[PDB]
Amino acid sequence: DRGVSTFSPEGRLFQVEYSLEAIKLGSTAIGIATKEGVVLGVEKRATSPLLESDSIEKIVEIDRHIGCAMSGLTADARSMIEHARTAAVTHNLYYDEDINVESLTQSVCDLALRFGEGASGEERLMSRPFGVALLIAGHDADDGYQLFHAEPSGTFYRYNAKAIGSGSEGAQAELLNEWHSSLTLKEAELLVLKILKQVMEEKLDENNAQLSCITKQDGFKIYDNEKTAELIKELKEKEAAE
Amino acid sequence: MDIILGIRVQDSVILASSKAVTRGISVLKDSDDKTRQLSPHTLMSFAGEAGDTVQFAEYIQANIQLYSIREDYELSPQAVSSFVRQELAKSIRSRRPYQVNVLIGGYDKKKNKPELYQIDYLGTKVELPYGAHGYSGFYTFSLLDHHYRPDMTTEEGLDLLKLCVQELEKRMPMDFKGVIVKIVDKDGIRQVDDFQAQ
Amino acid sequence: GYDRALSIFSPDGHIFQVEYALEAVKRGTCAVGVKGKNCVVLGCERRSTLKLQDTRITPSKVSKIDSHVVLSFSGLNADSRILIEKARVEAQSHRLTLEDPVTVEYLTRYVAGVQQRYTQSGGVRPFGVSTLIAGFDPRDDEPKLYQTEPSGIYSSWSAQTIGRNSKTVREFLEKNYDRKEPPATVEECVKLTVRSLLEVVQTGAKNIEITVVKPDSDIVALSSEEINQYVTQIEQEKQEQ
Amino acid sequence: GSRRYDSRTTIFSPEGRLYQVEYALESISHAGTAIGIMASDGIVLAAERKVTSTLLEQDTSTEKLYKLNDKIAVAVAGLTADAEILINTARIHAQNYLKTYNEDIPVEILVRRLSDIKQGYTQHGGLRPFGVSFIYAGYDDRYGYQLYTSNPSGNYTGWKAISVGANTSAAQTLLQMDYKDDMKVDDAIELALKTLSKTTDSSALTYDRLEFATIRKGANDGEVYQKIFKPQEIKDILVKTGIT
Amino acid sequence: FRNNYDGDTVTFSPTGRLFQVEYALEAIKQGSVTVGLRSNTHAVLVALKRNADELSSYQKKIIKCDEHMGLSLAGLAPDARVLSNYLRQQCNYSSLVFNRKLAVERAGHLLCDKAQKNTQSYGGRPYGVGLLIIGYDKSGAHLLEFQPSGNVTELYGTAIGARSQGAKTYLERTLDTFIKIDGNPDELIKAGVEAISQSLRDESLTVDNLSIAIVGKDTPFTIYDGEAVAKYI
Amino acid sequence: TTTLAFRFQGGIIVAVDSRATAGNWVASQTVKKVIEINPFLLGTMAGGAADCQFWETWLGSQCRLHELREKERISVAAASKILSNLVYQYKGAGLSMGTMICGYTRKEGPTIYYVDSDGTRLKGDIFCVGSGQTFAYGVLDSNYKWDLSVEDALYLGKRSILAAAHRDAYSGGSVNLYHVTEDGWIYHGNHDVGELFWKVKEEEGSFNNVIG
Amino acid sequence: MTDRYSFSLTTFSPSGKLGQIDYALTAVKQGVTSLGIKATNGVVIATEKKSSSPLAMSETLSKVSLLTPDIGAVYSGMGPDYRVLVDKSRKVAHTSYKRIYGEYPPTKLLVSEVAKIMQEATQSGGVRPFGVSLLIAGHDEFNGFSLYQVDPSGSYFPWKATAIGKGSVAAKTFLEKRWNDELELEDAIHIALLTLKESVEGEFNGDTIELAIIGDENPDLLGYTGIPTDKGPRFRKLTSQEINDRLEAL
Amino acid sequence: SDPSSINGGIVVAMTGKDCVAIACDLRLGSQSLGVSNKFEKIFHYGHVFLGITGLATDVTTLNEMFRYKTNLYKLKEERAIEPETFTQLVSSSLYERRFGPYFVGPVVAGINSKSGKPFIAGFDLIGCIDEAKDFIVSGTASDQLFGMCESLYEPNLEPEDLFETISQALLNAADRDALSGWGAVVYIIKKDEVVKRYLKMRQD
Numbered sequence A: 001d002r003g004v005s006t007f008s009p010e011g012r013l014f015q016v017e018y019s020l021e022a023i024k025l026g027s028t029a030i031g032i033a034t035k036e037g038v039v040l041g042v043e044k045r046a047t048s049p050l051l052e053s054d055s056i057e058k059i060v061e062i063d064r065h066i067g068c069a070m071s072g073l074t075a076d077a078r079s080m081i082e083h084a085r086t087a088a089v090t091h092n093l094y095y096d097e098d099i100n101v102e103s104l105t106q107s108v109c110d111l112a113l114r115f116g117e118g119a120s121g122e123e124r125l126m127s128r129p130f131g132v133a134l135l136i137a138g139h140d141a142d143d144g145y146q147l148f149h150a151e152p153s154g155t156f157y158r159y160n161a162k163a164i165g166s167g168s169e170g171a172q173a174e175l176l177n178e179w180h181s182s183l184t185l186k187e188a189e190l191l192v193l194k195i196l197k198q199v200m201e202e203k204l205d206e207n208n209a210q211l212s213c214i215t216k217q218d219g220f221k222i223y224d225n226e227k228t229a230e231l232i233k234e235l236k237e238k239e240a241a242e
Numbered sequence B: 001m002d003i004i005l006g007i008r009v010q011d012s013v014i015l016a017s018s019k020a021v022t023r024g025i026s027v028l029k030d031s032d033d034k035t036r037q038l039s040p041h042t043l044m045s046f047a048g049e050a051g052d053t054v055q056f057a058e059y060i061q062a063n064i065q066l067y068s069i070r071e072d073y074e075l076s077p078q079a080v081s082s083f084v085r086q087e088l089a090k091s092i093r094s095r096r097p098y099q100v101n102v103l104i105g106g107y108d109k110k111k112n113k114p115e116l117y118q119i120d121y122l123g124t125k126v127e128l129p130y131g132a133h134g135y136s137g138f139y140t141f142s143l144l145d146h147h148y149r150p151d152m153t154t155e156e157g158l159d160l161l162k163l164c165v166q167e168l169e170k171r172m173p174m175d176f177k178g179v180i181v182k183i184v185d186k187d188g189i190r191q192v193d194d195f196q197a198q
Numbered sequence C: 001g002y003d004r005a006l007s008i009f010s011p012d013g014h015i016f017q018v019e020y021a022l023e024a025v026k027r028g029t030c031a032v033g034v035k036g037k038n039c040v041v042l043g044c045e046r047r048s049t050l051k052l053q054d055t056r057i058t059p060s061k062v063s064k065i066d067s068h069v070v071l072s073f074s075g076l077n078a079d080s081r082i083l084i085e086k087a088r089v090e091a092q093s094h095r096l097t098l099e100d101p102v103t104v105e106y107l108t109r110y111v112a113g114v115q116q117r118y119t120q121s122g123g124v125r126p127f128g129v130s131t132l133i134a135g136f137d138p139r140d141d142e143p144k145l146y147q148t149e150p151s152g153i154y155s156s157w158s159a160q161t162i163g164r165n166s167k168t169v170r171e172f173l174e175k176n177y178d179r180k181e182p183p184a185t186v187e188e189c190v191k192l193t194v195r196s197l198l199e200v201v202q203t204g205a206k207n208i209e210i211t212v213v214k215p216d217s218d219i220v221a222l223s224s225e226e227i228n229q230y231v232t233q234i235e236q237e238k239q240e241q
Numbered sequence D: 001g002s003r004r005y006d007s008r009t010t011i012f013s014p015e016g017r018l019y020q021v022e023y024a025l026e027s028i029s030h031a032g033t034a035i036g037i038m039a040s041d042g043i044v045l046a047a048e049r050k051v052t053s054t055l056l057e058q059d060t061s062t063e064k065l066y067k068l069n070d071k072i073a074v075a076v077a078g079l080t081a082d083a084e085i086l087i088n089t090a091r092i093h094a095q096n097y098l099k100t101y102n103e104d105i106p107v108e109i110l111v112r113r114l115s116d117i118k119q120g121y122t123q124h125g126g127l128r129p130f131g132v133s134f135i136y137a138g139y140d141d142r143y144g145y146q147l148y149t150s151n152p153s154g155n156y157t158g159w160k161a162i163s164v165g166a167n168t169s170a171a172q173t174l175l176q177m178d179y180k181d182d183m184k185v186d187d188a189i190e191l192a193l194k195t196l197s198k199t200t201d202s203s204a205l206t207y208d209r210l211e212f213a214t215i216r217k218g219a220n221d222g223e224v225y226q227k228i229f230k231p232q233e234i235k236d237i238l239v240k241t242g243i244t
Numbered sequence E: 001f002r003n004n005y006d007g008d009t010v011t012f013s014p015t016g017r018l019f020q021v022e023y024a025l026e027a028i029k030q031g032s033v034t035v036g037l038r039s040n041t042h043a044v045l046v047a048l049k050r051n052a053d054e055l056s057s058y059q060k061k062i063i064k065c066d067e068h069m070g071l072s073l074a075g076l077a078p079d080a081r082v083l084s085n086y087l088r089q090q091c092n093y094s095s096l097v098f099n100r101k102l103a104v105e106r107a108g109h110l111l112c113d114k115a116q117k118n119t120q121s122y123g124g125r126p127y128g129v130g131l132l133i134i135g136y137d138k139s140g141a142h143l144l145e146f147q148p149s150g151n152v153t154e155l156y157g158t159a160i161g162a163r164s165q166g167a168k169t170y171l172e173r174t175l176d177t178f179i180k181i182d183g184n185p186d187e188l189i190k191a192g193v194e195a196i197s198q199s200l201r202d203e204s205l206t207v208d209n210l211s212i213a214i215v216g217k218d219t220p221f222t223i224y225d226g227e228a229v230a231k232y233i
Numbered sequence F: 001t002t003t004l005a006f007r008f009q010g011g012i013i014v015a016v017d018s019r020a021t022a023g024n025w026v027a028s029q030t031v032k033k034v035i036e037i038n039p040f041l042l043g044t045m046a047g048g049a050a051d052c053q054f055w056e057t058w059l060g061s062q063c064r065l066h067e068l069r070e071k072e073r074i075s076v077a078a079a080s081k082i083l084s085n086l087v088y089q090y091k092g093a094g095l096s097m098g099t100m101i102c103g104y105t106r107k108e109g110p111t112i113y114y115v116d117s118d119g120t121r122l123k124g125d126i127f128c129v130g131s132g133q134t135f136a137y138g139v140l141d142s143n144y145k146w147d148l149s150v151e152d153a154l155y156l157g158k159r160s161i162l163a164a165a166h167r168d169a170y171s172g173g174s175v176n177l178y179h180v181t182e183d184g185w186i187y188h189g190n191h192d193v194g195e196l197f198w199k200v201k202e203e204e205g206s207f208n209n210v211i212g
Numbered sequence G: 001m002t003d004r005y006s007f008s009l010t011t012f013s014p015s016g017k018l019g020q021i022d023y024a025l026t027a028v029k030q031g032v033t034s035l036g037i038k039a040t041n042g043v044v045i046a047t048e049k050k051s052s053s054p055l056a057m058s059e060t061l062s063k064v065s066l067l068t069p070d071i072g073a074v075y076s077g078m079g080p081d082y083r084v085l086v087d088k089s090r091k092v093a094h095t096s097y098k099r100i101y102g103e104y105p106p107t108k109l110l111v112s113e114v115a116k117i118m119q120e121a122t123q124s125g126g127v128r129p130f131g132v133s134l135l136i137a138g139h140d141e142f143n144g145f146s147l148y149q150v151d152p153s154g155s156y157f158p159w160k161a162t163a164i165g166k167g168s169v170a171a172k173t174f175l176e177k178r179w180n181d182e183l184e185l186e187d188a189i190h191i192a193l194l195t196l197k198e199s200v201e202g203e204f205n206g207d208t209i210e211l212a213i214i215g216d217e218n219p220d221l222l223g224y225t226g227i228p229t230d231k232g233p234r235f236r237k238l239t240s241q242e243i244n245d246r247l248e249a250l
Numbered sequence H: 001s002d003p004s005s006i007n008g009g010i011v012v013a014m015t016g017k018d019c020v021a022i023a024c025d026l027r028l029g030s031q032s033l034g035v036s037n038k039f040e041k042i043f044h045y046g047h048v049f050l051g052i053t054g055l056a057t058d059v060t061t062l063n064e065m066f067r068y069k070t071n072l073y074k075l076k077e078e079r080a081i082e083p084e085t086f087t088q089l090v091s092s093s094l095y096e097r098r099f100g101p102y103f104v105g106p107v108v109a110g111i112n113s114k115s116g117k118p119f120i121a122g123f124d125l126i127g128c129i130d131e132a133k134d135f136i137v138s139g140t141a142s143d144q145l146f147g148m149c150e151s152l153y154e155p156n157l158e159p160e161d162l163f164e165t166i167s168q169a170l171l172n173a174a175d176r177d178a179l180s181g182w183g184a185v186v187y188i189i190k191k192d193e194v195v196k197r198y199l200k201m202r203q204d
């Protein structure tokens, strides 16, 4: 056929590219950073009414000051999460200190290109690349609140706001205009909730959507349905307001 | 050593096991249960080295429970005792052997008879009317050699036991803090919570 | 030795071997699970391409991972055994190391992981199986129903079905099960399950097998009669109109 | 590299099927027919010897009926060579079970292990599956008489009557037409012979083209017995069932 | 043609080419421009950091390998990590074992051989990054250009990446001038920034867009970003 | 070293000394023999210092990882078995540690587990481990009642260590107290044996032998 | 390096055939004829020494080989494949039997071993099946004399008599006619020489025919004396001279 | 300390007229303590008998092993194994563990089904074979058995006489050994039948 680690004439790795396609087909995930914390939002997207919507975990905790959101083939994210968590707890065991958000990110990205059928660089055993992207958000004493985008390519960027998934291209455009260095956590909460509503095929409610955030004071917390439902209501109102 | 006794009467097997756990100069516990249930009708008492003892029993437990789940059937005592003798016979010639001696007592629901098995860390297995590990045998075998009968009832057997536990408290150096007794029969495994004065 | 990457990405971002694994699931017999208010019931259909089988011995579709958790499937039979065995061992191991039997959610997440792993490990094809795992956590009475698939994804359901014509029976359940008021009885919970299977089993008293799981390791598999009876009573429901 | 010549014997078809398994079954379909009929007091195994000659030594031959244990036997359909590799590992598994538990291996336990081995070649290794299907006929004290069947896929199931190899559709129908639960061993023996006699691609059904085995519990003993018939034995029973 | 000979690196085309390696080289041209130039006292790197959105950040292009050596990249960032990290170990091994600073010329030889291994065995893939390594060792300042093919070359200056030819020509022209900027880093850095702006087009180099690295006689390889590069834009 | 822990109405009391020796040489009088595994778990240090301090910190990491993974605080019975199994993997290698894993889970209530490098894991109400264990047992054993006030129980602990610090040459320095409730444990100060001894003597009239 | 052919080179075709085993058998068909006949007190196996140049010395080569003192082999197909199989066969007879029971294996079992070798060459990774078929003849105390044929597929079966290779079809028919269950060894040797004559184009003498018999114990071929139970090998290859003398009574 | 002297026990085999006998005690102890009086040391696989003295755990292990082997042997060879062959199997099985042997002393007895000839043989712990035509001894009281046999024994005894002789050798030998006794069993083997008798002896 054609090796999993082959280069395209344009200088790209086929598997990685195709990997990015599967991601576009993934649920929406948005992240907004503010000097008051970072907000992460995801589209549950239930394939049926019988499916208990809250058994859908697309936002997980890495550590008390680090959480992430996933988009794309999510079963793939499992081992990335385990690694990220171990890396965070381990760094603590060895340095008696919290792991910096960027380093945690950089750590996950290091697994990314570890694939092939005999790549002459070490012992990269994993048949294909990961088919999921991640939004990593947290806070640390060195660079405060941070949002990161980690891809199956093995690279990562830092964003003030970023959306990945099926509605990304448009949602990102929204953020481009909406975001500003003075947003408050609440503002960002409604903004995330609003963009999810626009791009979602379904009617946004506290059951097919989910919020959460990271604040230096209480760390990473995932909003329970009630807290969210209200923010949704408060959003509909201010919208009809004009 | 610890007190590990076993007696097979007419329709059940009785297992007595010292409750003390001493470490050097101090007796750390007086309510220790040196036993593990392998299946609804199979119980195994054990005594030996500090870590090996529990690690082996639980390991054997896990495997027999797995066989039960996988086969949706309960292995006969005889078979369970054969699996255990094998595990120890492997251990004996391994890098760091398990120093654990065990008594296996169970009720064969198919033959409808109780069975008692004595197995030592070497993998020595023997089937007996009554048996014991450690020094206990030294004062109890003659008692039982004298007063034992195959058709005794569970009650008769429980008395013969009290007789043994008495001789042991009289002539044995160590204070083993009494014993915990258990009966295994057609209906399963139950503990005689009233022997501290039965 | 052999480590060819069999599950890989295609231009449109799809892992075909995993998708084809799903197709194998669609072909397998049907399986269903509905959780009541104090129990969970699993029902599976039995093929009829041949009949002269000895049901006594022939391996049944609902397996026990432990004494409080069961697992049924749809897909390749051979492949289910590998998964069942692995989960069974994990069940005992977890008891040993944590001194506490696996929760249904956990045992499920483990099985899902095995599947996901087989989708990005060289030299192996994904499992042509999807599963339904149900039971009650230790010292808990709230019923648990979970589903897993080749991709490695899993989630919980109030009721769900997998296998051939699962499209049908799911529709049936979607408009016959109210989360507000779940089959408050073991009895009416077993009924909703037979009803749902009859939508596709096409008269098969001996072609349907049920298994009810109640809190505290109370699992039992109904016999033809107990089932046949449920079928009888249901056919009158239709005629009486 | 070598990826060029790799048949990928372990992947799914777009229809969710395993090519190799499918094709291997296609292979088995041209194999001599084998039937297993389970009566109330025993089990019967019969198979048709594919390709024979005047010169073929039949007294020393055995190409379909193999003894695994003292209470378990199998009829084969597919590659004899492949069958043996598996037959031997089964005979060993049987003995290990004994050595460990000091009890004879339950018929289903032996069947499952053998089927797991096949399943393996189906999921990893880049190797071809075993072109073989088995009809296991054994007895144990936990389920008594049992009849099982396993194929290249690694799946196995239980049966009252069943056949594998060539003309199975025809054989199954004929069996499905005259099999009765209250059957007796000799009844099964006859149904067996007759079924073959009608599916045979040959002119007539002679003893020299057959293999026969029965697992009965001779009353005047109390123990189950395996008996693999000798040429002169099949010849007798052949005349009696009225096929001369 | 080419389609039958580019499926992997263990195949030669009928004209003796290794396409997989050539496609790798392509990844570099697609990468952001970066320039390197030296004198007899200092060696400089200037890079144009690229960004995703305007809400994102500008990915780092320069990595420090030791107190006397470092490099800038163009291409697959992950690979630069792998390679610079390998170069760090080699620098480290030389210190620990021989209490000796790894010579730039040797670092280059090490890189070359590592890259090469991935172009002759089945299963591997060439690296998709280009590197410009500067450093000050026992024989002065040095500048190396590393290509995925395995070819490492020592130059006075050079540039790699999209529109690099602009800067390369400017240097090729200014040669006799900058090669003599001794005892004055700020000047060599300017000649650096000028050469790189010769490859601009899209935009103009800003403060959080430009990136400078400098190593030399009494200068431990240090990096400059943002406000730090202000006095050069 | 003297460390004790007992269960009672008010939950669990944990007391330890802080003397570290190397032969007859007193290395430290300021050692922390209570490892704070987390807001609900406590570990005691007896036997080899590094062996306890290290492997117990390690246990903490393992517990944290379990909670992230299971979204549920680890049980005391399980945290004790992780330490237990780890240590048994090294049986024979020479590790030296006698420890108590203490905690309060809604599911088990107050629980104490004894864990030594021998592979021994025991659940119980009262445990004294260390070279001064018998001296604490003496005091503790004869003044224990499930019905002790959280205040009287706290004192019995402090005093049981004082007893051991006196007689045992390898124990001493200061006393460290902990109170285990479900909301977690509560530190109850560091009590320099230097002063605590005199104080108790005067106020209690005990240690009558010593000349004051 | 490193054999990257860890997958099967012999797989199933949609029709259900195993190509390589088929092609392998085709190669057996092309090979020189060789046959075997079981008498009441012996077995005989023979083939034709088809010299591949008058400059080549066909004596420096054996198509009929000794496996154990009571088992001989012969083939049809690819010479080099037979050669390595003979070595492997002799070894396995030791490693898996003589070294355990202190006695040479019985025909069926040794034959069973060879079969296993070939079967694996049918499924193992990166290899092709063996392009030969063997006619193994031998004798053991509890089974008497026997003759087996082993195919590249790894299958094998017992024969009263049979032939393989080029003129096998013709030869088989001729044998089915002459064979009976009362033949003495000499008779079979004669019949053998006859059957062989048809398949032989050119010369037919003791220097172009290779034949061996599994008959009585040759104490004279032991090499030592003084051990009652050791009676000598039953396998004996005939000499050029021995052949001709019979070719006259042909 | 000495493995071959932890459990105790003895075995002896004799040949008579068209017959062979093999006998053993029933003791199984742990040093001075007697534990079981039902531990038999004779087993058989088909018409072949095997006595095993030594460390009990190994006595059990080897029995399970030879069962396993003789079973597969019959399945492949399609006949029961003979005494002579079995001897070779035992020997190589033991030498297989040359540098960490089973602490046992095996004794083989049987009549060759095909030749009708009686056969007995002994082995040391690493497989060395001793094939006598009169008698083989083994166990903690082997010195005694040697004195007993070397005297009592005579060729071609009848099954009824050989019984007396092998029983007398066993009994009196066991009575001078603290680690042997507590019962005994004797097997008399003829080409057609096998008789197993239990003996009456001291229990001290």
Ligand SMILES: */C1=C\C(=O)NCC[C@H](O)C[C@H](NC(=O)[C@@H](NC(=O)/C=C/C=C/CCCCCCC)[C@@H](C)O)C(=O)N[C@H]1C
Residues within 6 Å of the ligand: F001, F002, F019, F020, F021, F022, F027, F033, F045, F046, F047, F048, F049, F050, F096, F130, F131, F170
């Ligand atoms: C409790 C005291 C106790 O319960 N028992 C007394 C014995 C106990 O093991 C002593 C322990 N002391 C230490 O851990 C000390 N550290 C060491 O002993 C380190 C030893 C290293 C040995 C390897 C050889 C090194 C040679 C170096 C030459 C320069 C103190 C200092 O930590 C102890 O006090 N335990 C207390 C908690």
